[PDB]
Amino acid sequence: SENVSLNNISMQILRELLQYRRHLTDPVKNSAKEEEIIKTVQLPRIEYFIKNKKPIEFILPAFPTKSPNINKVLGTAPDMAERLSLIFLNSFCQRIQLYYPPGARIIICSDGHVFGDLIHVSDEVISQYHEDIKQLLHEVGAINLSTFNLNDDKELAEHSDDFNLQRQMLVKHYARSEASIKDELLQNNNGLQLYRAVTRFLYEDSLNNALQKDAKQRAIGVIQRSWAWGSLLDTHFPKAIRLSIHPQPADSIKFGIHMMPTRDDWLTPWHGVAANVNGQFILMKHKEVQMMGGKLVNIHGKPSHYVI
């Protein structure tokens, strides 16, 4: 029968994923139950790829652009924190080859032009971040990793000239009402914790109650836009395992993933800087490292990381 063998393969890929799971840390939660739920969730989607002897396909939306706050991050360009995370992702795909020869691939999807106005970053800066991240993949030989653009969608008419044109088309065909959004965020403690995180980060990027009010409204907007980019991808790559840089419920189709060691569930490399602390690279915010006795290190002139 050998379905035990097929289960043995897919369970190794799941067990590796689990070692890197990004979730809402709560001691009331019995993580054991969470996995048992996750196993039921993702194992079948994995097995679609093994059964057809194809590579395991992962879809991740991430690296949209670097945060504007100099206080939060060190530069506009992708620093060492991006590089290490990119390097980890591609290596994640190779260890799968040791179990499973077809291997695994991740189509990283650029989130930048989607919400670029709501986050207060120029469409031009976002574009440069994007070319750079592709270059970082070539510099580093991250073969298993791919990029998926906003331009890649056939329906947008290649509006390089007007991203706003691309923006309106995505909202029409793929967005839900912000009214329908606030409702959905508020039903579950997961939805509530997404809402706060998105509002906090937007407030942090600004750098007061009125500013907090702006973040609360901008949050529902940035959520709506990022969930549109989700449905665009939801149709394009349906059978692909879903990776997120956000914490996820154990019942979600999305699987939350960490790409660096970090004390924050929501911190991602475009909201931080890479710090070498006790011979371990850590993701921490550029201010918090400055109060730390942190010596900046720079590579190719542009600063890459802070060493402690």
Ligand X SMILES: [C-]#[N+][C@@H](Cc1ccc(O)cc1)C(=O)O
Question: Which residues sit at the interface with ligand X, rule CB under 6 A?
Answer: 64-65, 67-68, 111, 119, 201, 205, 222, 226, 268, 270-271
Question: Backbone breaks in the chain (C–N > 2.5 Å) follow which residues?
Answer: 207
Number of H helices, E strands in the chain: 10, 9
The least CB distance from residue 201 to ligand X, in Å, is 5
Specify whether the CB–CB gap between 284 and 272 falls below 8 A: yes
Which residues, in sequence order, are CB contacts of 218 under 8 Å at separation 6+?
118, 119, 199, 202
Select 73 or 241, whichever has its Cβ closest to ligand X. Answer: 73
The full DSSP string for 75-93 is -SS--HHHHHHHHHHHHHH
Cβ closer to ligand X: 50 or 89? 89
Query: For ligand X, which is the closer residue by CB, 55 or 78?
Result: 78
219: helix, strand or coil: helix
- Residue with smaller CB distance to ligand X, 50 or 121: 121
Using Cβ positions, the residue closest to ligand X within the complex turns out to be 67
**Is 95 or 236 the residue whose CB approaches ligand X more closely?**
236
- Least distance to ligand X from the beta carbon of 34, Å? 22
Q: How far is the CB of 270 from ligand X (least distance, A)?
A: 6
How far apart, in whole angstroms, are the C-alpha atoms of residue 159 and residue 88? Answer: 33
In whole angstroms, the minimum distance from the beta carbon of 77 to ligand X comes to 14
Least CB distance from residue 196 to ligand X, whole Å?
12
What count of Cα atoms within 13 Å lies in the side-chain half-sphere of residue 270?
Answer: 25
